[PDB]
Amino acid sequence: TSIMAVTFKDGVILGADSRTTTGAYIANRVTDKLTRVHDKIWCCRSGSAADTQAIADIVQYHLELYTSQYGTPSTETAASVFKELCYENKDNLTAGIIVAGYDDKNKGEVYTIPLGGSVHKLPYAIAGSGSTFIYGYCDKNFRENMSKEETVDFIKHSLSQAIKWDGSSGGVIRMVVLTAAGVERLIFYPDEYEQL
Amino acid sequence: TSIMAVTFKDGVILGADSRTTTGAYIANRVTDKLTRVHDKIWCCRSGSAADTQAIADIVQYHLELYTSQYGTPSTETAASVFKELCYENKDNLTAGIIVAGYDDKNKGEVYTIPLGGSVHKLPYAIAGSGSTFIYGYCDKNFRENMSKEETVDFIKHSLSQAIKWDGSSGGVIRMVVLTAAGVERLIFYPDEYEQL
Amino acid sequence: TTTLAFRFQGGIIVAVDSRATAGNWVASQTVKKVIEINPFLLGTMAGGAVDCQFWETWLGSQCRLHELREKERISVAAASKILSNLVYQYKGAGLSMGTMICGYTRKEGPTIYYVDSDGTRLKGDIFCVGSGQTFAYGVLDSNYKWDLSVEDALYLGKRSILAAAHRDAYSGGSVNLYHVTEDGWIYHGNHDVGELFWKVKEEEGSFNNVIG
Amino acid sequence: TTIVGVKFNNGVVIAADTRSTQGPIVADKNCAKLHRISPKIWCAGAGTAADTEAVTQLIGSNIELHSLYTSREPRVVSALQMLKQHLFKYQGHIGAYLIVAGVDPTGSHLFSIHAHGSTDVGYYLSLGSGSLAAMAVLESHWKQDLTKEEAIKLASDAIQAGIWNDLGSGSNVDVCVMEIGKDAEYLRNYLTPNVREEKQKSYKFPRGTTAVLKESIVNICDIQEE
Amino acid sequence: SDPSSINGGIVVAMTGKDCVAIACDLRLGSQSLGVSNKFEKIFHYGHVFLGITGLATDVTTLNEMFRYKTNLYKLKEERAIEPETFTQLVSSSLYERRFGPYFVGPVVAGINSKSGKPFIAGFDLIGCIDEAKDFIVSGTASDQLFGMCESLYEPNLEPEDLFETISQALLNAADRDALSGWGAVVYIIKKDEVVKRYLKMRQD
Amino acid sequence: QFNPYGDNGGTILGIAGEDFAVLAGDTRNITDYSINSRYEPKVFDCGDNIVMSANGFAADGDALVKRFKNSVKWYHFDHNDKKLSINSAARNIQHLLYGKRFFPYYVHTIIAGLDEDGKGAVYSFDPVGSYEREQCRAGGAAASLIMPFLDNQVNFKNQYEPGTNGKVKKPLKYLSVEEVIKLVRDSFTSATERHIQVGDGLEILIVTKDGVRKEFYELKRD
Amino acid sequence: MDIILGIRVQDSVILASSKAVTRGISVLKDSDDKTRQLSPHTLMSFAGEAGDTVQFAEYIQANIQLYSIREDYELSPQAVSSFVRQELAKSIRSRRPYQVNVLIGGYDKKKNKPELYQIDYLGTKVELPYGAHGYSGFYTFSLLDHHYRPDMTTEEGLDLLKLCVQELEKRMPMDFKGVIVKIVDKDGIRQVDDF
Amino acid sequence: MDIILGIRVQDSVILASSKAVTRGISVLKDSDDKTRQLSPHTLMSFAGEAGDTVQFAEYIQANIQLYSIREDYELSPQAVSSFVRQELAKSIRSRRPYQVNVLIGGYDKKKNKPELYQIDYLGTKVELPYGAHGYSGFYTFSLLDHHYRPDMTTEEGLDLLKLCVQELEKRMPMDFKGVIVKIVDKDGIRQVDDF
Amino acid sequence: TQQPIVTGTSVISMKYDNGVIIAADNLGSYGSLLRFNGVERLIPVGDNTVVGISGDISDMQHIERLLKDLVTENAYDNPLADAEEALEPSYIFEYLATVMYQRRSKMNPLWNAIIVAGVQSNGDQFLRYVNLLGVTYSSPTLATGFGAHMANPLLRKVVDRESDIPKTTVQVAEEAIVNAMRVLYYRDARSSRNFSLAIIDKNTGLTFKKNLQVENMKWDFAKDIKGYGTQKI
Numbered sequence A, B: 001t002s003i004m005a006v007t008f009k010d011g012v013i014l015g016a017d018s019r020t021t022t023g024a025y026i027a028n029r030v031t032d033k034l035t036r037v038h039d040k041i042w043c044c045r046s047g048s049a050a051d052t053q054a055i056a057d058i059v060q061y062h063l064e065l066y067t068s069q070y071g072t073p074s075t076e077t078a079a080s081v082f083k084e085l086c087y088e089n090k091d092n093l094t095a096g097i098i099v100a101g102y103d104d105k106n107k108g109e110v111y112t113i114p115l116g117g118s119v120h121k122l123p124y125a126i127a128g129s130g131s132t133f134i135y136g137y138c139d140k141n142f143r144e145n146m147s148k149e150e151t152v153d154f155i156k157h158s159l160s161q162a163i164k165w166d167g168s169s170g171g172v173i174r175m176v177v178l179t180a181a182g183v184e185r186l187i188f189y190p191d192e193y194e195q196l
Numbered sequence C: 001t002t003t004l005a006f007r008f009q010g011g012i013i014v015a016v017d018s019r020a021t022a023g024n025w026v027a028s029q030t031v032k033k034v035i036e037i038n039p040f041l042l043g044t045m046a047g048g049a050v051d052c053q054f055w056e057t058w059l060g061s062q063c064r065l066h067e068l069r070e071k072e073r074i075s076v077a078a079a080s081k082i083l084s085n086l087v088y089q090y091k092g093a094g095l096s097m098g099t100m101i102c103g104y105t106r107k108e109g110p111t112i113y114y115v116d117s118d119g120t121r122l123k124g125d126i127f128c129v130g131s132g133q134t135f136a137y138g139v140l141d142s143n144y145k146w147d148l149s150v151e152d153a154l155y156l157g158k159r160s161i162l163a164a165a166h167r168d169a170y171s172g173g174s175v176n177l178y179h180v181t182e183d184g185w186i187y188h189g190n191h192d193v194g195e196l197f198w199k200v201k202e203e204e205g206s207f208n209n210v211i212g
Numbered sequence D: 001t002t003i004v005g006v007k008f009n010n011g012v013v014i015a016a017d018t019r020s021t022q023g024p025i026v027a028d029k030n031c032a033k034l035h036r037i038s039p040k041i042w043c044a045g046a047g048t049a050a051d052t053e054a055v056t057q058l059i060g061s062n063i064e065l066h067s068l069y070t071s072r073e074p075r076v077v078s079a080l081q082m083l084k085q086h087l088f089k090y091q092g093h094i095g096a097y098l099i100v101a102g103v104d105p106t107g108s109h110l111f112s113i114h115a116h117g118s119t120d121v122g123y124y125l126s127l128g129s130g131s132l133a134a135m136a137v138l139e140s141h142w143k144q145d146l147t148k149e150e151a152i153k154l155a156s157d158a159i160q161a162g163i164w165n166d167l168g169s170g171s172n173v174d175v176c177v178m179e180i181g182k183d184a185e186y187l188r189n190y191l192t193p194n195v196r197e198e199k200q201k202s203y204k205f206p207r208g209t210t211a212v213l214k215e216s217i218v219n220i221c222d223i224q225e226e
Numbered sequence E: 001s002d003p004s005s006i007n008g009g010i011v012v013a014m015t016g017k018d019c020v021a022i023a024c025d026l027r028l029g030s031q032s033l034g035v036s037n038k039f040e041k042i043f044h045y046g047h048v049f050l051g052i053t054g055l056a057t058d059v060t061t062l063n064e065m066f067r068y069k070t071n072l073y074k075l076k077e078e079r080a081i082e083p084e085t086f087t088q089l090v091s092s093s094l095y096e097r098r099f100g101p102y103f104v105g106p107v108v109a110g111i112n113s114k115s116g117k118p119f120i121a122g123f124d125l126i127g128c129i130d131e132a133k134d135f136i137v138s139g140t141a142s143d144q145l146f147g148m149c150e151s152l153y154e155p156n157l158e159p160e161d162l163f164e165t166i167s168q169a170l171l172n173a174a175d176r177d178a179l180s181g182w183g184a185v186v187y188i189i190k191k192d193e194v195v196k197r198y199l200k201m202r203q204d
Numbered sequence F: 001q002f003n004p005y006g007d008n009g010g011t012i013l014g015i016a017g018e019d020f021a022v023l024a025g026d027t028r029n030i031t032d033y034s035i036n037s038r039y040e041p042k043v044f045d046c047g048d049n050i051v052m053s054a055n056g057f058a059a060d061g062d063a064l065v066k067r068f069k070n071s072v073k074w075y076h077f078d079h080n081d082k083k084l085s086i087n088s089a090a091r092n093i094q095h096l097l098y099g100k101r102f103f104p105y106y107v108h109t110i111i112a113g114l115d116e117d118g119k120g121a122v123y124s125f126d127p128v129g130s131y132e133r134e135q136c137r138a139g140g141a142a143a144s145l146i147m148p149f150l151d152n153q154v155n156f157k158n159q160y161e162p163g164t165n166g167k168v169k170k171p172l173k174y175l176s177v178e179e180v181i182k183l184v185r186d187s188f189t190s191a192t193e194r195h196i197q198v199g200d201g202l203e204i205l206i207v208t209k210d211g212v213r214k215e216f217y218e219l220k221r222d
Numbered sequence G, H: 001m002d003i004i005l006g007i008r009v010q011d012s013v014i015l016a017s018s019k020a021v022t023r024g025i026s027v028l029k030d031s032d033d034k035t036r037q038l039s040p041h042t043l044m045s046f047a048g049e050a051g052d053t054v055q056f057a058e059y060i061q062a063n064i065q066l067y068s069i070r071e072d073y074e075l076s077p078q079a080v081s082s083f084v085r086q087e088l089a090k091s092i093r094s095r096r097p098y099q100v101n102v103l104i105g106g107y108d109k110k111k112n113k114p115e116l117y118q119i120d121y122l123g124t125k126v127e128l129p130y131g132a133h134g135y136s137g138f139y140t141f142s143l144l145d146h147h148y149r150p151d152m153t154t155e156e157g158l159d160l161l162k163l164c165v166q167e168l169e170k171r172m173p174m175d176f177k178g179v180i181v182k183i184v185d186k187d188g189i190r191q192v193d194d195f
Numbered sequence I: 001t002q003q004p005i006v007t008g009t010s011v012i013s014m015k016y017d018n019g020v021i022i023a024a025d026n027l028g029s030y031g032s033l034l035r036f037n038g039v040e041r042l043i044p045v046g047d048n049t050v051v052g053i054s055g056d057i058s059d060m061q062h063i064e065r066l067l068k069d070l071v072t073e074n075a076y077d078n079p080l081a082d083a084e085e086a087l088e089p090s091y092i093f094e095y096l097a098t099v100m101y102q103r104r105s106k107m108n109p110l111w112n113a114i115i116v117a118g119v120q121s122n123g124d125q126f127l128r129y130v131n132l133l134g135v136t137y138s139s140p141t142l143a144t145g146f147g148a149h150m151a152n153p154l155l156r157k158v159v160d161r162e163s164d165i166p167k168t169t170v171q172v173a174e175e176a177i178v179n180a181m182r183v184l185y186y187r188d189a190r191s192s193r194n195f196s197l198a199i200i201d202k203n204t205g206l207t208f209k210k211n212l213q214v215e216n217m218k219w220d221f222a223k224d225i226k227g228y229g230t231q232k233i
């Protein structure tokens, strides 16, 4: 799995591959790992598909019930709910989740939640098996306050490499853009990103 | 360990960190992993220090005896001797070696020999625990027929990142330049490469 | 450990050793392996030191409560069965006990019950329990009669422990003797094996193997 | 065990503590961990005691025969090569962890050796259970162009760090100095900072306190004449 | 299971003024079962004394081996082996079985016939030499012996005082060990006379 | 796998006199081959003229001492400020230890004080609660080194009277507080020499009818 | 196999050895002689793993008989016992060790003394007044400690041996089907046919 | 414990049960009665793990005696055996199962027929003419297959039972110290004191 | 029972004449991967206590929340929350020490080694250690993980016993701490160059220093080191 979330000037963008594997067999080559827990709070999922789905479903339920009582939750609040589930059930879960959201007050924010259940607020985050191969590239090429087009290119090039080297990662590169303008879905096919 | 060999216009350059670890304790912070098996045939060593030393010592012996009978050996020949030892003793060895040399006829050549004992001739090669983090960076930034200065910068930046992310790698960045001009040793200290 | 108890004309003889070990390390040579449950009941201790101690002094509390409630001395059968039923609840948990519950009552006469951490409860005339039980059995079985004097019975029990104290590496220290009648038990002294061995060897003419 | 080696201006110094342990028990309080491979090549040993002794004697023996064969004073690299190839062959089962030092016609040298047969070069080195305490001192106080007096001080201070802070190390500090163009000086018990205080009481018994069964003269002499 | 504590037993050696003392218990057992109370663990080859604890079959085998070697030594050298030399021979012999060792704890004791200097030495099961000035201990109650020796011992004891110290060290150590005891022997060794004493101790 | 137990080393020693009692223990605290503290008190005054030490795994040791001190407090509340006798303290500690029979306090407990007749008393416990009144007891790492020395020098074992040759034993004469402290100091000096987990300092608590007094002595720090 | 006993009296050595041969579930034989005559005045009883016991005993027997023919002379019990110990001490570090424990009862015609040696499969030799292998000793040594006197006659030795066998028959779980008793003295080796 | 046998003849059921109680090394008792009377015309013998055997037997005994008092009526052997089976069938899926095998010999006063039930610790019930638990059956069933004719008298049953015990005493390795024999018929339960 | 995932390495500390110093690097390792480079492992509680935590970072963050909640709870119905009834280092430690031992006793430990450094009401220095097993001890110098092996030896050369504390100034103590951090960077394969340092003085209060770096490092001698024995070039 190759997933990443990157903050930029206008907000935040989530990116992911589309490969689900049972050993070396690709069970699903068009998976959607970018999932919605609230209107402008999404998450990237890595690890167990069952665990991350079960978690994401529960979080969406919590934020829906939060919204009905206290209005729109912050991205920090969403990350906290994810953390509470991942930390308290650490013995029985295998989930690496990146939480990304857009407030008007806080703008684009990214929280990463690795296996342990710890939370880390970052400018950008990378995760999944394929992330190991792009630490060098991402560290060297990331800048703060990038444009939308620059951030899309940064994510596209990064996940392109992660896919190239990691067998567990592949298929299409899905992306979700979170700004004041709204929610935009982007897709990029092998013929496009492989020649980069 | 972070090691790499890169061919360029005038020949080939070998690069390595200087960290040797026993678990999390750094047994040696100024190790020389760039070792000489012939005048202009060197190797990078990764894995077991004892195994790679024992192998390198034997190879140097074989190439010294080869030279006395048949004159200067090719880099391919050196790689073959390494392979023969690593392949035939694969059950008892833990050695990841990159062989790099300079002929006048063949110019700069690089052969990588991973755990199995297989041989792979490449334009450039990366190996060791820290190499995982710079596959993306190296693939994106490598060009053929680079200059000496460009190749030094390529290796310096690459190993800088590998060191930054890998705990097993660190200390100084050693390099050895192999050209028609001769053999040049280069060293780069933390204060220099960390700020890159 | 070597502990024995046997019925005879004059009541019951109880004899025990004094050693406690942790591996090859001798932890103590002065252990009281006989519990004075009341003026009429004795319990022997073998196996786990604490398990035997804790639960046999607990047994004394249950026996006291019985005679407070029933205005009558508890039987040896009832007392032994309280302990065996207790350890049976703990079966599998890892308790380690080999015990004789010895007493005299009017209705029963002199009675001995072997109680065990596996739940075994056996009534009998002679019992030897512990790592050195086999050594004690040899002397006992070849010299036992119903018609023994209190004096001769006491010596046989003392001698049988000595036999085991010598051969069994995990037995020794000293010998504690008790004699149980219908007016209660009667203590018959602590006998150091370091002095008893040379005394018995000389007087009895035994242990000709050893040089003294 | 704490063993160290320190290079200086005109040579090299090695040092060691004197504690040997079997589990949590001290087997020997004044153990000799500095071994002589040749007159001017000495090494300190950590790990399994019989192995550090045996592997040193064997290589030291062969080094002597080699020196006689070649009519040359032995070199540290020769001892190093012979030790590493021997240890490698036995795949770490010979538990000898060595700091090899010495002076020869090539110059002064300092190396470390591990049980699996890997070697390392350095200006300052430390091995054993107290190597972390020692290396902390060496990393704090070492510099280039040390004098002989400064190197001995640094080496013994590094051993002391092991003695006091590592339970696997204790008692005394042994030192051996190997300077170029000079005899190697072996300083047995260079420091003695762990003398036992006087006991409160004398436990000398009154004669006849122990009970005896038999007495006899033992014949240690040979069969006699006449 | 552990070979060094199947049979059980102990040896202790001490130095005094112009003398050495070596002592051992007499027990041989099969774990809990006491089998023999006459199993002596101290042997001598000329004026050099060797005590051996550990697995009894190896104790016997090594005694027979060192008798073999010291007898050939004497025929060729035309003199009795000395304690310092014998110590090196024991070390050599044990280490040659590095990866298939004799499960023993040898203890050498004696006086050099030429210099007159008292000598004691200990070994692990594989040959490492412990050449102590004061005392050497070995066996299943080695910890106990270390404690006794470390408190009771003082240097330059006269032969008849040294006898009392080593005897009390052995006896009280053995009494805290299940696999040691069943009698004891003490050798008092001077340059040209040796006295052997059997001690009266508790037989449990 | 998580291992809930550890070994903090150390060694303790209790000796009962004729009208006094001492409970000594080294002040070194360790894990593996590292020293945690050169002065970490191990022997504690628990009130009612009782001193206690639970040697072994320090976390279980501190927990037990803490719970016993607590038991003394509640004994006063529940029984009209009655003094907890040393024998009653000992039995109470047996139940504390056995309460965790199947997940034991991994410690070697010793308490010292005076019995109800004013004589010196030392009680010794195993980890699971079996106990016994003794005249002499060493506990912990170097217990195997010290106990044989105490059998010889406190109870005069294997000692006989000169001239009689094994016939007459050495009489069991009583030891003064000055004589006991000498034996304690020599025990720990000897234990320090041959045991790596013993050293740094020795702290002795002396119990008499007048109260609890402390004495501290330096030990070798290697 | 199971129970083998030995007792050295004034002028003879007496060896008692069980008759049962049990293979797991069933008792296949109740008249097995677990002994071999090594020489006219030396008898060896044995017990251990199946096959190994007889194979070892007969191998030792052959070697001693070979020695006897070569030198026209009977080895002392001490000498034979030392030879046997060495074979077992050699055996214990073999690829597949002999799993055999033995008792060697002999009469030394030179010293006019009976001698009993106990040797286990490790090569652990001891000379004793009375000995046993396996669980036998656990019951019998206490009786022998009490009753044995070294000036005993052969008839007194047999009575003391009956007391040992009776105790074993009372307290041991396994039915060893009685014992075959053999006496070794100055006149050689003979079997007590009624026991 | 070890050997328990049962044989149903014309007009009675005969249960034989060993007297030995062994703990590892020693035979602690040689007169143990491994049976309980559940009702005047129903006897249960038992063998299995120590403690569990008696605890189970006495628990069953108490329950049947309780039933007898409540209804002033004796349950049929078939009914008792079914109750026992259910307890064991319940037990086998417990936290700690009863490790007990039983034989239930009873005389049904309504049908005037002897009945023998064999039940193992799993709760496996079978009605048989003759039965056994443990290794006993391996030796005895062949003899019973040959000699049992179903119309035998009680005296013929005892003779056939002696032939079983003799075979066990010959071929079994363990000394079970003989058996206590008990007969269950129309007149109730009695013990054969000489066997 | 668990295994630690994201981990923090050594926490080192010592007493000096007027207070205590504590330090810890800013790294959150993920096995051999040096994953997170901006993790604060010194967490102040009031203006008189600093809790330094090593080991599992998720469990550290849990402990951080407990301490934050402890301050909140102490303020409830407490007019002297910022005065006489303020939280003491000894109160904060004993609380943690209770939790650590309880959690190990339920076989579900907080996988940490903790050092509570602070100054009490009466001006006394407080410095005590606790870990996943509930083991506690105090000393003039305290360190966790690799610090125990490498820092303590260096810090004990400054304060070897109790009587050395009044003789040690804050400048000498800080110098020793900063040197120890450098040594750990040389030798600990799971350490970082960036660290935080906290000083709790009885006069000048709590000084919390962020974004410190290991400097004055010796690496030049590496150029002379060639091969592993016989190699000259």
Ligand SMILES: *[B]([O])([O])[C]([C][C]([C])[C])[N]C(=O)[C]([C]C1=[C][C]=[C][C]=[C]1)[N]C(=O)C1=[C]N=[C][C]=N1
Pocket: A001, A002, A019, A020, A021, A022, A027, A031, A033, A045, A046, A047, A048, A049, A050, A052, A128, A129, A168, A169
């Ligand atoms: B990715 O590779 O981590 C991916 C992300 C997931 C949210 C779709 N996970 C998987 O494909 C996992 C296996 C796995 C791979 C790498 C690391 C950890 C786990 N697959 C599944 O969970 C799976 C596979 N087949 C069917 C159902 N679920």
Ligand SMILES: *[B]([O])([O])[C]([C][C]([C])[C])[N]C(=O)[C]([C]C1=[C][C]=[C][C]=[C]1)[N]C(=O)C1=[C]N=[C][C]=N1
Pocket: B001, B002, B019, B020, B021, B022, B027, B031, B033, B045, B046, B047, B048, B049, B050, B052, B128, B129, B168, B169, D114, D118
């Ligand atoms: B590098 O990390 O692979 C390095 C290269 C080596 C040639 C110096 N290897 C080591 O440091 C190895 C351990 C190791 C780390 C990572 C992967 C594989 C192996 N160390 C040793 O071989 C070693 C350590 N301490 C003493 C001696 N040898």
Ligand SMILES: *[B]([O])([O])[C]([C][C]([C])[C])[N]C(=O)[C]([C]C1=[C][C]=[C][C]=[C]1)[N]C(=O)C1=[C]N=[C][C]=N1
Pocket: C001, C002, C019, C020, C021, C022, C027, C031, C033, C045, C046, C047, C048, C049, C050, C052, C130, C131, C170, C171, F126, F130
């Ligand atoms: B006895 O040997 O069984 C003895 C009886 C007990 C009441 C003191 N038990 C022990 O010595 C046991 C060990 C043991 C040895 C042999 C068989 C069974 C058990 N020792 C302890 O329980 C113990 C208690 N505290 C300290 C040391 N040892």
Ligand SMILES: *[B]([O])([O])[C]([C][C]([C])[C])[N]C(=O)[C]([C]C1=[C][C]=[C][C]=[C]1)[N]C(=O)C1=[C]N=[C][C]=N1
Pocket: D001, D002, D019, D020, D021, D022, D023, D027, D031, D033, D045, D046, D047, D048, D049, D050, D052, D128, D129, D168, D169, E123, E124, E128
């Ligand atoms: B040191 O701690 O490395 C020290 C140096 C040695 C060369 C004198 N090592 C020892 O003392 C070793 C420790 C050790 C214990 C157990 C297995 C392997 C190593 N001790 C011995 O080799 C030893 C132990 N008992 C007797 C003799 N020697």
Ligand SMILES: [Cl-]
Pocket: A020, A031, A032, A033, A049, A053
């Ligand atoms: Cl999915």
Ligand SMILES: [Cl-]
Pocket: B031, B032, B033, B049, B053, D118, D119, I228
């Ligand atoms: Cl290397």
Ligand SMILES: [Mg+2]
Pocket: B048, B051, B092, B093, B094, D091
């Ligand atoms: Mg290898």
Ligand SMILES: [Mg+2]
Pocket: B163, B164, B165, B166, B167, B168, B169, B170
């Ligand atoms: Mg690094």
Ligand SMILES: [Mg+2]
Pocket: C164, C165, C166, C167, C168, C169, C170, C171, C172, E203, E204
């Ligand atoms: Mg004994």
Ligand SMILES: [Mg+2]
Pocket: E174, E175, E176, E177, E178, E179, E180, E181, E204
């Ligand atoms: Mg003993």
Ligand SMILES: [Mg+2]
Pocket: F191, F192, F193, F194, F195, F196, F197, F198, F199, F222
């Ligand atoms: Mg010490």
Ligand SMILES: [Mg+2]
Pocket: E035, G118, G119, G120, G124, G125, G126
């Ligand atoms: Mg034997």
